[PDB]
RNA sequence: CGAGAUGGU
RNA sequence: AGGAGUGGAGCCUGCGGCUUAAUUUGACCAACACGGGAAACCUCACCCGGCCCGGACACGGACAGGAUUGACAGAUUGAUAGCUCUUUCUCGAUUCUGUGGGUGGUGGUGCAUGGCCGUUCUUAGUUGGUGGAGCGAUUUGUCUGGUUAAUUCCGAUAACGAACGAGACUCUGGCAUGCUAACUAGUUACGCGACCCCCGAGCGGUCGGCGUCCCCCAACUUCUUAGAGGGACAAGUGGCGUUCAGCCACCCGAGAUUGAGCAAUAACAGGUCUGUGAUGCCCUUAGAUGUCGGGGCUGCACGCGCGCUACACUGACUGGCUCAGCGUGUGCCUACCCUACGCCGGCAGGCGCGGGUAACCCGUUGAACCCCAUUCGUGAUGGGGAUCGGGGAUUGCAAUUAUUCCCCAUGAACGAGGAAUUCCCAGUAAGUGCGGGUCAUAAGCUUGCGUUGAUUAAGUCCCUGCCCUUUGUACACACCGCCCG
């Protein structure tokens, strides 16, 4: 389907962020968080919405794939040490922000 | 445009000449029958192309050696 | 047939009928050799000719599977009762039939036989019954979870005009392995037979050959000779 | 002999 | 060098975005009138509801005062689904029930695969064996030069002898008063026969003119069909060529380039699991991801692609005259075909009654532009025909979100199109209409056929690319590369 980058390079597999896109809330050891700055080397400065601020770090898994940036909204695991640090687990689309703040699961604080 | 003849017919002409120089000489129209009872040829097409080079061989023996 | 249907349906559905019959003898006989059927019609009745290698597995213990064939081309095809009849033939020269090769070739992977082994064995057997040339094709997942293919080839092979019609002889076939389908393809080329049915009876197109000239004398002197 | 930088899949 | 354009207008149709219960989905030169994809239902995958088993087989249980099957009426329901509730008849070992195990799926993965197709790539390219050269990866053969549409030929030569592609080959167009021979094809002629005209030497005639008017137990194959052979070779003459291989002009001739099909080695994370009883693994399996009723695929501030109709006088309207070629036709489950002739109606259409399973009947296939005569008069006009009101037929089980068709009325933008950009060299471009596919109903698409018929070239490497050789490199994920403060 349509391509929104351009280049030679159709030698991977198509995205596909489509259909079954099945709304995912927190566990155990979770927090919602936007992103403040962007930093170099693949970390970033995050807030949480009950006001802890953090460095943040991408998980191999979402390198050149999931592009973050300032002011998104992003799901983050927790540390049981180094409580200063933490990891990107998922980035919500505008669409799924406002279905978060609709059930009630964000404090009136996100931007969308 | 082009006119150059293939190695099928020059190989093919040479032959005939080596063993069939008494029966050939300069008319088109007796060659191409010679042509026909001392080989088979499968196209009708093929038999003029070979008929015509050895009309053009024969025209250059009556002046000097050809080397092949 | 109240009223006869017109030529051109008659032709055509003439073709759909040798069709369907080729595709059930293809499955059925697999294993037994099968490579061809052969359909001629005489007032009253229709004699259907069919080629295998191993003829007495087509027959049965005394005649079982050609009379439980004929039954059902005559119940699936609406024949009248004893109009049909079905004769078993032996393939002459099996290295030069294709489509025996490729079946043979299936049933030796399927019994787990290595890849190269075997393909190495029918190219010696085709090469040794007296073609011209061939080749061998096997394409799938051949040793590990990344597709490949393989060719093997020996002699002479011709791939373009119309000579290809009627010189060269041809198979297609799939076989399933616990992994997934590997495909198989058989190309054999045949040798220029000018009557004995090994071959085809047509010279190649460009292949001119001259006739040898013979027992001359040089000299002469002049005579004559009555009756 | 005009001007002609750059590179997620 | 030029021709017709496209990009600007209205409308058709494919795509994105937005909207929605759903607006199912693949594809981004080599996607976008493409999935043969013209969806009323079906197709159908999406959305809202409701029945059904079409859960083999094995083991255990239950069971001939009986395992189980089906249903009238009232309530219920979109519903004449005994679906469910109340009631009480009916069938007969076929089922039911628990466990194990199967079976189906237009479900997921084309980045797990087969088969098929597209593309690199329409150009001239590719490879062993024995011998020679290097420790080696590699190399020569496969070339300095000339010649050709061509790794096509000549020739040169540490290489010799071969294989595939090219070419040959197959179909097709143009020629035969020569051959074979026709009541499913014609001509000529007459035994003649018949209607009409005197225009004709001359009468109303033997004799003339006109005929798809009609017999032949006449003669024949020019015109039609289609089998076999024939014909063209750079063969002849004049120039130019390391005088070879070839190239240019001209005579004679139906004809001195007709147009397609088929096509190598090695690749691509190209497309297809939604063509398949081709297929691995995963998912689901009775409150189903295996059938009926209704809705959607058509929704509209907006951006883009392939097209149809036009802006008029080299025209539009109303009469009159006269010429094609390629095809299809009673559906074998599946239930429908192509139409002459007569009658009723302004029209679309209706009734009756015949031929055709087809060189036999529709049919001498009375095609459109073009051709001859008339009206309008430079006016958004008698150019253009979008948008919209009212009425009548035909298909179908059903036409509203208008299936298609006919009639009166209404009468938009548009006066040859900004920056850009596509295709084309002869019976070609462009104009013009007709068949086939899909089809119960129906082309503004596509695949073929005939008819009218030009202007400009016979060249070049400038722009975008392709082939070969010499050359440089810090590149090999290969310039859409690598890399410095």
């Given at each position: 389907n ?9 030698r ?8 079954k896109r099945?709304?995912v809330?927190?566990?155990d050891?979770?927090?919602?968080a ?15 919405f009950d006001?802890?601020?953090?460095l943040?770090?991408?998980?191999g898994?979402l390198?050149?794939?999931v592009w ?6 992003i799901?983050?695991?927790l ?8 990891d ?9 922000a ?8 964000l404090?009136e604080?996100?931007?969308? | 445009?082009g ?10 002409a ?5 063993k ?12 191409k029958?010679?042509?026909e009872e ?6 009708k097409?093929?038999?003029n ?10 025209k250059?023996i ?5 080397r092949? | ?5 017109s030529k051109?349906?008659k032709?055509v559905?003439?073709?759909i009928?040798?069709?369907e019959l080729?595709e ?12 061809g ?6 007032p009253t ?7 295998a ?6 027959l ?11 039954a ?5 095809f609406g024949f009248?009762?004893?109009s049909?009849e079905?004769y ?8 030069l039939?294709?489509?025996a ?11 787990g ?9 029918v190219?010696?057997?085709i ?7 061939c080749?061998?094709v096997v ?15 020996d ?6 005009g119309?000579p290809?019609?009627?010189?060269v ?16 393809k058989?190309?054999?080329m ?8 090994i071959?085809?009876?047509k ?6 050959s001259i006739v ?15 009756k």
């Open positions: 349509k391509g929104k980058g351009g280049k030679n390079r159709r991977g597999k198509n995205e596909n962020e489509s259909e099945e709304l809330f927190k566990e050891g979770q927090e919602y936007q992103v403040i700055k962007m930093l170099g080397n693949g970390r970033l400065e995050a807030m949480c006001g802890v601020k953090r943040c770090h991408i998980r898994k390198r050149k794939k973050i940036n300032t002011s998104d909204i799901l983050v695991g540390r049981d040490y180094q409580d200063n640090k933490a990107v687990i998922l980035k919500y689309n505008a669409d799924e406002r279905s978060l703040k609709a059930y009630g699961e404090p604080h996100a931007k969308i | 445009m006119r150059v003849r293939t190695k099928t017919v020059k190989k093919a040479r032959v005939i000449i080596e069939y120089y008494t029966r050939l000489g300069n008319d088109f129209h007796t060659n029958r010679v042509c001392i080989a088979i040829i499968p196209s097409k093929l038999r192309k070979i008929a015509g080079y050895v009309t053009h061989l024969m250059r009556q002046r000097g050696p050809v092949g | 047939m109240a009223v006869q249907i051109k349906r032709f559905a003439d073709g009928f040798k069709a080729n059930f003898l293809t499955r059925e006989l697999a294993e037994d050799g099968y490579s059927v052969e359909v001629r019609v005489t009745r229709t004699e259907i000719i069919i080629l290698t191993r003829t007495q597995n087509v049965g213990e005394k005649g079982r599977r050609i009379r439980e064939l004929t059902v081309v005559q119940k699936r009248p009762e004893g049909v079905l078993a033939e032996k393939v002459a020269t099996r290295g039939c294709a489509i090769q490729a079946e043979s070739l299936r049933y030796k992977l399927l019994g036989l290595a890849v190269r082994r075997a393909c190495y064995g190219l010696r057997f090469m040794e019954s007296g073609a011209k040339g080749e061998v394409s799938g997942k051949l040793r590990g979870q990344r597709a490949k293919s393989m060719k093997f080839v002699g002479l092979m011709i791939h373009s119309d290809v019609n009627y010189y002889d041809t198979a297609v076939r799939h076989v399933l392995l616990r992994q997934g389908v590997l495909g198989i058989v190309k054999i045949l040798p220029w037979d000018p009557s004995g049915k071959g085809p009876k010279p190649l197109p460009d292949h001119v040898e000239p013979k027992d001359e004398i040089l000299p002469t002197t002049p005579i004559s000779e009555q």
